[PDB]
């Protein structure tokens, strides 16, 4: 309930504050991973088959910079709102929400 | 490519429940009128001249 809740709130009610903090978190996450030789090597290898032959490292900060609370809100609502979930558990799942409940959690009437 | 009629309808009116509801209010209105019109017509047809609406002539304004 709380999680889905968070999703929804996200694509309707994001505040610049909130997005700006996550922004910065991202930078760090993305800089600190690259500490050490192994880490840099994997980014460089995998980056090339993934994103092709670019190393968007310095770009990032730029891209990350274009982040706006509206940007984050519109981008999240493509993928989470009204969209149908993919849910797996490995019980005690006896209380796990009925597929339709989970589903209705991706839109906002109430709750 | 273009969005199926439904997809069009969807993205314009049903994403936001505000819109959705607005729709339904509007629709309820429009619909009531057409229904009545059509459904009254249909019913009067089945009783041609049987109803006062048909029969007012006789004693009206001479």
């Amino acid at each position: 309930f709380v999680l889905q809740g968070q999703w929804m709130r996200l694509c309707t009610s994001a505040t610049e504050s909130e997005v700006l903090r996550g922004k910065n978190l991202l930078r760090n996450a993305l800089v600190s991973h690259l500490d050490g030789t192994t880490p840099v090597c994997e980014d460089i290898g995998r980056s090339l088959l993934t994103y092709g032959r670019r190393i968007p490292l310095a770009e990032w900060e730029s891209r990350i910079a274009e982040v706006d609370a509206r940007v984050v809100r519109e981008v999240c609502s493509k993928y989470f709102y009204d969209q149908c979930p993919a849910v797996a558990g490995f019980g005690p799942i006896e209380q796990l929400p009925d597929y339709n409940r989970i589903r209705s959690g991706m839109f906002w009437l109430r709750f | 490519v273009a969005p199926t009629l439904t997809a069009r309808l969807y993205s314009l009116l049903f994403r936001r429940t505000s819109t959705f509801a607005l729709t339904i209010v509007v629709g309820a209105l429009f619909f009531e009128r057409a229904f009545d019109q059509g459904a009254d017509a249909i019913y009067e047809h089945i009783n041609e001249g049987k109803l006062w609406k048909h029969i007012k002539h006789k004693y009206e304004n001479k």
């Binding site: 994001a14 | 936001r16 505000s18 509801a21 607005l22 209010v25 509007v26 209105l29």
Partner: peptide, 22 residues
């Protein structure tokens, strides 16, 4: 935030409703 735009379609709805319904 999104509340004006949402409160503005919620506004409309009530209005249309009364207008019509009543």
């Amino acid at each position: 935030r999104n509340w004006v735009p949402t409160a503005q379609l919620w506004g409309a709805v009530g209005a249309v409703g009364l207008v019509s319904a009543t």
